[PDB]
Design a protein around this ligand. Sequence first.
Ligand SMILES: [Ca+2]
Length: 755
Amino acid sequence: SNMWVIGKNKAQDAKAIMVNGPQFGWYNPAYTYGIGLHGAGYDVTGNTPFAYPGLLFGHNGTISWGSTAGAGDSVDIFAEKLSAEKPGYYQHNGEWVKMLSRKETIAVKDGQPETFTVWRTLHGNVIKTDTATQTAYAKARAWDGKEVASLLAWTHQMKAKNWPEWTQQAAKQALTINWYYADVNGNIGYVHTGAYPDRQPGHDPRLPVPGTGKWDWKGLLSFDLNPKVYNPQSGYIANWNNSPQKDYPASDLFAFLWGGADRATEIDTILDKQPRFTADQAWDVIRQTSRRDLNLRLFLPALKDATANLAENDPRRQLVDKLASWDGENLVNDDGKTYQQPGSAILNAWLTSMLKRTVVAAVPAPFGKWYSASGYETTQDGPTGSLNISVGAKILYEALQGDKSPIPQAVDLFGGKPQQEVILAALDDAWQTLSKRYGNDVTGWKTPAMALTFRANNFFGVPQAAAKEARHQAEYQNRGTENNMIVFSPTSGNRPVLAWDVVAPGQSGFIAPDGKADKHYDDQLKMYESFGRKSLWLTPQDVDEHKESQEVLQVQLDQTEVKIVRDEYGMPHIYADDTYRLFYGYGYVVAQDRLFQMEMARRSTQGTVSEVLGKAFVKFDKDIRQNYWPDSIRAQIASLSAEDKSILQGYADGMNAWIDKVNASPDKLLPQQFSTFGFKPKHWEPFDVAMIFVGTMANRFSDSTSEIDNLALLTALKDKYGKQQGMAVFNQLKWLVNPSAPTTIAARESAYPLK
Ligand SMILES: [Ca+2]
């Protein structure tokens, strides 16, 4: 996910420009949902994943907001001490405490149901038990018990009118997500939001800690410690999942590092090349970053040095000369099947061989496979997400930096051989593989282009459309699933704010019972491919002047009415006087546009897929249920104020109003996928609405830990290199922090005070 926010000192013909590209993968229907909300203190326009009540990408006429992933470490594993004589108990503060447990039955269509038990301790749900060590591993998330408050913070931030009001809501968002701000006066800001644990001294957050009491978190760190910047000296804020600030620690995933090699550097390269950017030029950064090879910049210097004394008749030199003449941008040939230059294929073959000879060889099996990917992995459908510099390549980059790297090289990744020798041997391997495939003339190689697919299964691997609904795009683009831009105080025109976005394939996922797709089913697919965009309207006049339809909706609870206006792309705008009715309108239009997608997202987030799709989803459903505690979510909802509850209740009741119409006339209104998969939609409750957000936001971007696997790697490293060198090699592959990491906030603004 990327973002660039350009302030008054860096914007041309405007006071601020915000361009966001969240990367969630590609799907049909669209991952995000376009919506405008007008009333009850809200006046917003934008789009948001799974139609959450809170819009992730949009503006209110005064401020605009966005987000990117890039988790720090807010998830730890507590190794609970068990008793052979007291099963279901664990030791805490000198006593045997009983675990909570719940029974769950997975109903299976045309199959056999399965019952299992989910266990939970004061640290969290149990994710693994180990007989030999009498341990039950419990997953502690700093945001546990704050899932519903996080959803409400994302909704209430839409009403903020300045930096202090907005940061007040940012402090209430507990998931580890980057938040961005821009406003009508040209101010820009960033907050790396999230609840973070205040750990005991000596707690290494990359590995499990005993759950017996001594290692319990002291509590949560203050919001004063969350990285933030307002109007940075640079005049811009850029991010591509990289570190928020100097010395800020990343999540403990062995596959995730913030090091000297980072793709975010590519955005800074573009933004620093000219003093100011217009709205069109800021949008054009999407085209440029989408086509950038991320590895050329990192490895070309070492490749040129290794081949410096080779003659042009040497194939190793021919490969490097081809990379040296390349601008590093990938373009597709007229055939729509091959790249104009072979550079990425050459880097893939070389980097794959380099990793095998360096990082992979230094790590004992079976852990070498964690560092073997080059970053170019793809299928005929193309990459399922963004392209990044691989974890193996990041570690190799530090080794190539030598003394310039701040990471101590506890093990020489080159194994005693000079770095030029290994680089040349990898070039020999790449030459053998590539010349066998394309012949010996590198100037004529037509390497395959990566393609892009809007998948019919959602990110969980669960159908949200029929298989024939997959859509194809010839050119893979390393960009947001959606892209949106807000321009504040443009000098041209009479509007104080302009906004655009692209929600592909379309606003609607509706396919009628007879197979007829809605007119807004795929009318944004060509616009997506060509880097186009459509206007987002906010004011009643702009919405009215660009409308395709207008209607009134009678609220089932009291027969009052809300107004819904849809724009020329089918995007709905809700007009209501209070929270309950505003969110009722929202729920209703979501049920009209995305009912099958939302019903499948509801089943995905609650682990109730097998009930309708059969035995194929049983272990998926079990894994979902093991990873949450419904009583916690229900208790959080029960304790809400009437006003906060009205958001969820209004939304569910609104969906229900349309579901009632669908079920009374299914021959005309039932989305075709319900007939294809053989079931009917049923009513929603506030719990269902909360679980769309918990299951697709909290569990997708804020529930990452590999501490158990990290411990197994550390154990194997100590077996191979000894206790001392083994821990130092662990620090080289999975450093806590790397001061050379490119950061969103410049070191001169602020650094992380915790060491
Ligand atoms: Ca951790």
